[PDB]
Design an enzyme around this catalytic site. Sequence first.
Site: not given
Length: 341
Positions: A145, A246, A292
């Site tokens: 991320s 996502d 994620h």
Amino acid sequence: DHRSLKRANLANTSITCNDGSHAGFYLRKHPSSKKWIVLLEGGWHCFDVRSCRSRWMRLRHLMTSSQWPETRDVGGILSPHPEENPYWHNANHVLIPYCSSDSWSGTRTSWRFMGALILRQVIAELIPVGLGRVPGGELMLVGSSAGGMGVMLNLDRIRDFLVNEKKLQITVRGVSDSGWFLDREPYTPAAVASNEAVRQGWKLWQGLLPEECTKSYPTEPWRCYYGYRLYPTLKTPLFVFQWLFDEAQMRVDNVGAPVTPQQWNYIHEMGGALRSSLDNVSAVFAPSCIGHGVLFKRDWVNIKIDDISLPSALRCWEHSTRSLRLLERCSWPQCNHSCPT
């Protein structure tokens, strides 16, 4: 080296988390390997007074080092067990926690944003401890991320630091996991436009963007906070892992918890835009699953596309970049036999 990663501090004490507390990393040195995996921790970020105040009330640990344990265990690609990490269990392992709230791009000295500075310092600190000490070493800079963006924004700088300033004999590669976001029409209007937040962030953080990308958007360099804009000017090899549905992109798109077909159909189209935004990418692993992050998870061995597991695709990419597109071929949420849970 089954033991945990061990906390370490930075020499230059002017390099800090958001609140003024000192930054650093965790290390697990391997007695003989020349390969290094440096994992940048992720999260989101904060770009103005309200969001930062709120993050400090709702997520203090990502803005300060005070709650940090003396050791950390991390699975997936920083695991020392071969069952969990079949190709990198025996490398040197570094974890850099994320306490700068700036997608690892800040250079500013009520808060400090030293992301890019933290990263360059940690890498500096690894040289005396063996990084590229012996020719034929390898550094894999990986992140999830915001860690993913951290990798893409600094990867070229770090290669050029190590191969050129420092003249080390080392191959340098990057992996971005779940850090490839899109600026598109949200499902419902949100308080701030995606692009306005990125602009404020850049200025608040004094974000350090890569020059070749900055050249192609000279009116507005903050465009380089998007994976898909950064990528075409990136010279160092980058492997992109992306869940096509996502969850973080859904929060950004302001979809709420999907319980209606209009929400689910917006999600379906959101996967198609994600997929297309990966058209240019030479090394990519993108399954049609809701998710994620992946690199830190024990499950990372289990996700396959055309019976090619993620570690296995990543290993092949390493082989062929010593000097690879896997996108799911069906298009709907959870069509992959091996989607997680």
